[PDB]
Design a protein around this nucleic acid. Structure first.
Ligand SMILES: Nc1nc2c([nH]c(=O)n2[C@H]2C[C@H](O)[C@@H](COP(=O)(O)OP(=O)(O)OP(=O)(O)O)O2)c(=O)[nH]1
Ligand SMILES: [Mn+2]
Ligand SMILES: [Mn+2]
Ligand SMILES: [Mn+2]
Ligand SMILES: [Mn+2]
Ligand SMILES: [Mn+2]
Ligand code: NA
Ligand code: NA
Length: 310
DNA sequence: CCGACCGCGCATCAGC
DNA sequence: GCTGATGCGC
DNA sequence: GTCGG
């Protein structure tokens, strides 16, 4: 937490711009600043020192001056005290409720966790589940449960087909000691860039009562809720089915971080390449046989999953 | 000063 | 009933 | 909000 005070402040600003202002690029601006400062090896003594960093500019430096000076920020205090603002900010904590629905609930006087409970009729399936597990979803997941979870999924997959390969990605693959959720990258030989595979994995995981609820489900992505058997908290899980011959782009994507992916895909465009969770193109998909192969194509040195937490 | 700022899967519902 | 526009989230 | 064109 070298500069935690400042990165905490910037993260709150970001959240406000996203949820309340609905200014996604300001959100991204503040998270880049926060990200860049988070990897700064020195304790920031002024805004001027901070301003030297790319992503940090005039408006942020002045804010850092005020925070190092007054120990707080006036803009934030103002925002925390505004009813509409704080209300919207709070509702977005519910899975399925974004800036638009939050704002619209608040306009009709629905601003608390209780108000949503007495208005179930006005939530879609996804929001209801977000409300139902509101508390549980804000709880972190210890790697000890992640390992357990990893084992219940990998083995339930073998039990559908031995050629299925399930790889747990996300914060877990980065080596985090706790994770927001569980992300599973799934492949199988009968599915490539050339021509009910996920349904089968979802069904099986449902029968053994690991998957308790469904938020969204298509032919390549599943988002739902899972739970270790006996009571543990309910947890978020996402499964992504990726063409076997695109494992490495997929696993690079699904490993993150979200900020790292945005950094990498941008630097990609600099060097003349476009990256998605499937291919890296110039253009036709270039040949890839490892994650590193991707870091080569774009003249950025390789970095172990543990060193991708942007 | 202006304005671009990664890439994509699934669900909902206003407006026909 | 249908389907883009839009929303939400990875 | 930021930075590069
Ligand atoms: N291109 C792109 N990739 C993203 C974005 N957001 C995002 O999470 N990803 C990728 C990187 C993440 O590791 C992966 C899974 O998302 P996640 O919500 O489970 O986050 P996470 O595993 O890194 O962290 P955690 O909070 O669950 O512990 O999706 C985004 O906005 N753009
Ligand atoms: Mn995750
Ligand atoms: Mn996830
Ligand atoms: Mn401007
Ligand atoms: Mn459609
Ligand atoms: Mn996330
Ligand atoms: Na700067
Ligand atoms: Na939300």
């Amino acid at each position: 937490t070298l500069n935690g005070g400042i990165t905490d402040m910037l993260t709150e600003l970001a959240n406000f711009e996203k949820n309340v202002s609905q200014a996604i690029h300001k959100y991204n601006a503040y998270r880049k600043a926060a990200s860049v400062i988070a990897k700064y090896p020195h304790k920031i003594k002024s805004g001027a020192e901070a301003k030297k960093l790319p992503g940090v500019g005039t408006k942020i430096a002045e804010k850092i001056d005020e925070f190092l000076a007054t120990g707080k920020l006036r803009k934030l205090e103002k925002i925390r005290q505004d009813d509409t603002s704080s209300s919207i900010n709070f509702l977005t904590r519910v899975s399925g409720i974004g800036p638009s629905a939050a704002r619209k609930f608040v306009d009709e006087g629905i601003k608390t966790l209780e108000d949503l409970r007495k208005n179930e009729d006005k939530l879609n399936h996804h929001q209801r589940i977000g409300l139902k597990y509101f508390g549980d979803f804000e709880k972190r997941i210890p790697r000890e449960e992640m390992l357990q979870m990893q084992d219940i999924v990998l083995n339930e997959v073998k039990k559908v087909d031995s050629e299925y390969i399930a790889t747990v990605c996300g914060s877990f693959r980065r080596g985090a000691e706790s994770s927001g959720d569980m992300d599973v990258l799934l492949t199988h030989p009968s599915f490539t860039s050339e021509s009910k595979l996920l349904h089968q994995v979802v069904e099986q995981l449902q029968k053994v009562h690991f998957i308790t609820d469904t938020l969204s489900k298509g032919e390549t992505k599943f988002m739902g809720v899972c739970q270790l058997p006996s009571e543990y908290p309910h947890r978020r899980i996402d499964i992504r089915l990726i063409p076997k011959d695109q494992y490495y782009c997929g696993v690079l994507y699904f490993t993150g971080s979200d900020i790292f992916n945005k950094n990498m895909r941008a630097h990609a465009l600099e060097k003349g390449f476009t990256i998605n969770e499937y291919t890296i193109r110039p253009g036709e998909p270039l040949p890839v046989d490892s994650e590193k192969d991707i870091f080569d194509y774009i003249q950025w040195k390789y970095r172990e999953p543990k060193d991708r937490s942007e």
